[model samples]
Target chain A: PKEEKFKKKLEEELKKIRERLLMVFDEERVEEYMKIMKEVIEKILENRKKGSKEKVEIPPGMEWFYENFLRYYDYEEEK
Target chain B: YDKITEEINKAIDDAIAAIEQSETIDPMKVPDHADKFERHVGILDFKGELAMRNIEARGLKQMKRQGDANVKGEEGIVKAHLLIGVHDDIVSMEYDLAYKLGDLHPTTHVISDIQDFVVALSLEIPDEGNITMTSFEVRQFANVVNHIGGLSILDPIFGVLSDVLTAIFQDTVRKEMTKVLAPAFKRELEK
Candidate 1:
């Protein structure tokens, strides 16, 4: 039950983030910024899931997703 | 109900019109359509078989690992229809299996370029990548159950029959994806 709940939450959050990014990019005004951030968020999510501690920095492109969604996103992979 | 029926009729008519007005289907496209139909049928059949096999396997394996009773079928037959049905569908099905079975269940995706590597990278590159990944993701006993529940309503549902079907489908399709049969994909990749 816990695992199921966790998986569902993770999927929902990921979907929400993707949908928001798509919407923000749709409004041409912030299109370039969103594109840059999309790649950044993808990389961040990937690296964070991995145990990367080397020079963790969000590229300027994906700064928005972080700013809006997470209060203080920490990096740690559940074992 | 009437409104829903009306919408369905409209959708059917639209599809019919599209098909009727379309130019002659390309000979090259035949393989793709055939592939889709084959995949659909494969999923149905795979799901049915996986459900039953997993329950028995699970009860045994979860009780302990190794020294378990061997599956009744010979390695050849077991190997043949790992994922997709028929000899021809083996290749694509194997590729699909390697991606999911090898990558996602174990940990985060090692590379975002998995699909890219399968589709566009040089043959040598893809081959080497799979070999490296396969070591880390050697199929395990529990994986036998995971495949079934992981891919179908079995995961979400509570019925024994449903679970068995899910397991059968997942294992069958996984073998298909993993290239246990002739005319199968040269390599397997799990999603």
Candidate 2:
């Protein structure tokens, strides 16, 4: 009984917090952002598949995501 | 529910493993402006496992710190709990993070038991293959739980700093989910 009571209280508080936080972002705006991200990623991948030798240029707002989020590396044998 | 959890976990596992297996240096590095508050710079290595019970999800993460003098490459376990909901083709996740320090030096012992650290993310799958992060937010509760040398002090300073760092860390997660996993998921779809 004690454990169930504690769990119930925790869930209640978590619900309150979740409801309050979700109000910060509008659903329509969030969906628009996701659409942009999907488009940019698809374009970049398409460029890579075309076998172009030049570096793939990302869209304007996505430069930060490209440089920070994407992974690139040069390898060398350890001495 | 099981299918959703499996898809989410598989995406996370593949993205993290991709970064780890690459020879890329500082793959987990955030921007310099974001790191302004951090004193001891370190590279982080993360390995995560996911388990779900109904709508509640748990992530077990082992985080290894490298290249910091104070920590000297210490490893720790961070457990995260999430309440997940799916509506209108969008998945909403609200999670709290808790961590325990392991084998740390005396100086870094103060960094333990970060509680009430919350992050919320909304994800959507467009018709164009990968799952995209729709929205992200992070918030810290009033209660600060810390154990510094066995003395509990009501210090708001550490709590504020942790909140800022956690927000940046959540942004990193958003990018990783979209950038790294987008291509990975595309490969998966092609297969």
Candidate 3:
């Protein structure tokens, strides 16, 4: 259940960012960014399938948004 | 080992040829301000524009960059080739750059010739039916960057600069290849 919850949260965050990126970039560019995000999810799933307990970390070059922008959405929801 | 090697080698060849056959990018499709320079304190940082052209795959090589040789297996000797054509245009600013040219002034320059290079991709399939590129190396047989004005005398500077851009370009292709390869492989696996 915890893994499922994490997956949902990750998907929502990806959707939010994709929407933001689409506002500035063309479909091709936005899709390119989304591919990396999907790869992050796939890696985590792959590790889980292999029975590894390592924590899933955000991919490189995406930390700023995950830390600052995505965190804000959680804070707002809690309120 | 034989079957796996054959499958991977074919996959690599097909992928490279597909990119080579893809349509050349139209100049109008290039993003705005794709050709621009960065400046700080009257020093020109870099100026270039994105250009598109059809490319052909040449050959593959073992990556010699730091930490690349760590991968070990029969797959350790992984090889692939993808050729892409890149253009760096500063034709519109030639006059401006020439005016600023001086010894140690570092005026902006452009690579007049087309930048066509081969990408040798080393991939590993950690899981069945999944392909992942572990490392890649770029090889440019032609002079990709050209200096304009008196800056032609600054060979050392341009050489180092070109090397730096080549490294960055390799990293870019690595990322883009992952995006392009994963989906196609998945579709084939499904079928």
Candidate 4:
């Protein structure tokens, strides 16, 4: 089932992200931090491609996360 | 009608008393017993808005800024806890409706009627002190948010669960609550 598959993938990716988070907490490194997040987001996108529909689309609060996190770096600008 | 109103009022009073009793103990002092009560108190009065917002902001920021890098561990804990809490509330209310309402009536019909009655009585009993207490608690929560930097996680959670909870609560109350009161009214009508 697609639902089961998505859930399994989500759990696996979330676990990896969580482990990385613990590592960051233990020894805060900027590179380690950035790598963990990149992996998680890529996984999320992959999950989306694999048919995991976002049940709750709205981000928590009135926050716009893109501005909070993404605006800090511009991939195109770096290029 | 008078008899039914009396019964409903008593039920409301009982609910309030339950909330009050649950509030008296220090959750820190009586960790095991207090935890359950504290959670119900939250449903009666949902605080933790700032905490919720902080989790949201940090989670999003980490997603964009760090990509695959390990997020601060605290951020994942906060997000996971929020999800669990929200999911629990949803699941609990669903069970209450299913079990309490029996198989006789559809949950929706029962809850809509209860909501309508609550609204009507609220208007007539405009001076009820309980309403003021409920309002005061709400304002107190809002004030706490303002003091704590005004970031609110509740908005997102509310967006996700409000419609669903409303439907569940309505039906559950009717099945679990209103039906109990209906019997008294039925006897009154017979008289």
Candidate 5:
């Protein structure tokens, strides 16, 4: 019962937001953003390894978002 | 231990490949069973839009002077698509985000299609292995006005759902996401 109820509710919220997003959100931009994410992950997987010399070249303003992810590593170590 | 790590790594790779294949589907295009997947992709797309609104509305104010460039329509937008899944026992968030920003503050402009972004944080609930962030992720660091203030913000995005319905859904969604790994994982950007 709990699981079903939860599933039902989440489905509802998703649909509601889903409809609005299709409206105000630019299809071109969403597609482009997803493309950027694919690239970011591809590079992160490469750079996150041990002794990797490659520096992450984030598109531009996203330097902070990229840093924010790594910033989590800093928060954990805090050294 | 090495075997455990390898299985987890394979699982993560599988998840990546799965979403990567799905990436080919056109966002603007319609579908069948494919339609369901498109709607599934929409879940994360919508979540990203919501997160950016909150960040633009609240997160930029930490410096107090940051709001000078807060434009209504096209000031900035950050979009994310989440791929969270489990293969056997390992579950992970293979999340990616990208943003376009300009004039975060007048004379202090920002302009770019800063899209290259991705992060991987996986979890394993092993029979013997105590649960931990193998990714070395941090805790709440409490009292920081932190965390996304829960997911109530989900309802107000459309604001058509009943308040009580919204509460139960946020309640359900929050609880269910932990178990189902379907809901978009909302990470605090705080950058």
Candidate 6:
């Protein structure tokens, strides 16, 4: 109940943002980037699933998603 | 009757269509959302088991120096799914918005670039000289219950379920999105 109203607000903002970004994005390019993103994310999840602390490798061309999305990649590994 | 919920729900449907049609990644399986604010129609917990994790990073260098104790956090593997069965035909519907808060060490817990010590590749947006930015993420838990009976469910629902499903869909596909799944990208496609 506490978040019901705010959730509604957030929902609207998200839609507008998604639509606006879509206008600026290239479908073919976004699709290609998404493909690479999935691969990088898959590798990271697989590593975590198997209890491996191995790091994920972002492809040469695409690293934005890595920095923005899976940002644990940007944060430091426990020192 | 909430316009906001519908807006987000529609977004997720679009993403599902794209996922189903993806050539590189298997349609049935896709990676979950990486950030707090990235995904399709948010979350609509119509029904089923779901798994998720939320990590919040708090830069606590100052707070720690005040005390000489090392701070530890929650870390583990979380997996959830639903099992539906009924004596009669069938039905599925449930939206339980359950979540817990978590914290992370601010500066000590860092993420290194996946690339070697070289100028990393970055998107050059016009007029977007990279400025210093500080960012953080926080997401809630998601786990839906199973409904069983001899009837269909038109779960005209309410809040919080959106957040839960958004997280769940990030992990796996749910039958809820399948009901309204359609390739309506022709709007943008025609552009």
What is the TM-score of candidate 1?
A: 0.19
Instruction: Report fnat, model 2.
Output: 0.00
Highest TM-score scorer: 3
Instruction: Looking at model 4 chain B, report the run of 10 residues with the lowest lDDT sum.
Output: B54-63
Instruction: Give per-residue CA lDDT, model 5, range B1-191, as digits (tens).
Output: 34544544444445444433442211111111100101122223322111111111111111111111111112232111222322222111111112211211111111111111123343423334432332311111111111222122332221211222224223432233233221111111110
lDDT of 3 by residue, B110-143 (tens): 4333343333445556534666665444443344
Clashing pairs in 5: B32-B35
True contacts kept of each: 0.00, 0.00, 0.00, 0.00, 0.09, 0.00
Q: On a 0 to 1 DockQ scale, where is model 1? A: 0.02
* Local accuracy of candidate 6 as per-residue lDDT tens digits, B18-129: 5335442221222232223322221211232222223211111111111111111224311111111111211122222222211211111111111110011111111212
Chain B TM-score list for all models: 0.18, 0.29, 0.37, 0.23, 0.25, 0.17
- Among all windows of ten consecutive residues in candidate 1 chain B, which has the lowest summed lDDT? B111-120
Screening candidate 3 with a backbone cut-off below 3 angstroms (N, C-alpha, C), the clashing residue pairs are none
Off by over 4 Å in 5: A1-24, A71-79, B1-145, B150-191
* TM-score winner between candidates 1 and 6: 6
lDDT of 4: 0.25
- Sort by lDDT, top down from the best: 3, 2, 5, 6, 1, 4
- Model 1 gets an lDDT of 0.26
DockQ of 6: 0.01
Q: Worst lDDT window (10 residues) for model 6 chain A?
A: A70-79
lDDT tens readout by residue for model 4, B1-191: 34434544454444433432432211101111000101111112222211011010001101011111111123222110000011111111111111111111111111111111221011112222222111110000110111111111122122222333344334432243333323432332222
Docking quality of model 3: it rates as incorrect
Report lDDT (Cα) of residue B116, candidate 4: 12
lDDT of 2 by residue, B19-105 (tens): 345432122221222133322211111122111111111121221111111111113311212222111221122223222222211
> Comparing candidate 1 with candidate 2, which one achieves the higher TM-score?
2
- TM-score of predicted chain A against the true chain A, for each candidate: 0.40, 0.50, 0.55, 0.35, 0.51, 0.51
Winner by lDDT between candidate 3 and candidate 1: 3
